[PDB]
Amino acid sequence: GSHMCDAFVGTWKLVSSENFDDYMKELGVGFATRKVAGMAKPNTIISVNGDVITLKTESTFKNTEISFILGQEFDEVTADDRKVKSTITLDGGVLVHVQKWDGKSTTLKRKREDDKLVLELVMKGVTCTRVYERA
Ligand SMILES: Cc1nc2ccc(Cl)cc2c(Oc2ccccc2Cl)c1C(=O)O
């Protein structure tokens, strides 16, 4: 059968970024990692096997991989090496990813808009948008 996650499945490459440096500062990312991360053009591969969604991100300097069930909290190590407790849910057709660590929180929303995969990353007052297109 068809699922709301179907539209996300596939291989994606970064095409544009807005306010990523500010967002990384809010996360506590240091100067050098901000420079190196800002240069990268990651690929993200989203796949589904039964109820398990896998999201991989590959880049020149860092690869990440999470597998999860919607609504079930899990341990995640982020690209900037935060050790977080994460939960990912569907809100309509938007994947909502909340990461909690040291009493802090950031929310990452993934949505399909036109032929793009749009990521909205929010920490305190700062919103970054990262746009991906099919690879
Ligand atoms: C959502 C997201 N969050 C990030 C959080 C922190 C950093 Cl340093 C990179 C991030 C990042 O880029 C990367 C994610 C993995 C490897 C490399 C990069 Cl630059 C993404 C992203 O666009 O998927």
Curated annotation (Swiss-Prot):
CDD domains: FABP4
Modified residues (Phosphoserine): S16
Residues recorded with modification Phosphotyrosine: Y23
Position of sequence motif Nuclear localization signal: 25-35
A GO BP entry: response to bacterium
Top-rank lineage group of the source organism: Eukaryota
ATP-binding found in the keyword field: no
Subcellular location: Cytoplasm; Nucleus
Residues annotated to bind a fatty acid: R130, V131, Y132
Modified positions (N-acetylcysteine) in chain numbering: C5
InterPro entries linked to this entry: Calycin, Fatty_acid-bd, ILBP, Lipocln_cytosolic_FA-bd_dom
Signal peptide: none
Coiled coil: none
Keywords: Acetylation, Cytoplasm, Lipid-binding, Nucleus, Phosphoprotein, Transport
Major localization class: cytoplasm
Pfam families: Lipocalin (PF00061)
GO molecular function terms listed in the Swiss-Prot or TrEMBL record: fatty acid binding; hormone receptor binding; long-chain fatty acid binding; long-chain fatty acid transmembrane transporter activity
A GO term from the CC aspect: extracellular exosome
Known role: Lipid transport protein in adipocytes. Binds both long chain fatty acids and retinoic acid. Delivers long-chain fatty acids and retinoic acid to their cognate receptors in the nucleus.
Oligomeric form and interacting partners: Monomer. Homodimer. Interacts with PPARG.
UniProt domain comment: Forms a beta-barrel structure that accommodates hydrophobic ligands in its interior.
Similarity section: Belongs to the calycin superfamily. Fatty-acid binding protein (FABP) family.
Protein name as annotated: Fatty acid-binding protein, adipocyte
Naturally occurring in which organism (per UniProt): Homo sapiens (Human)
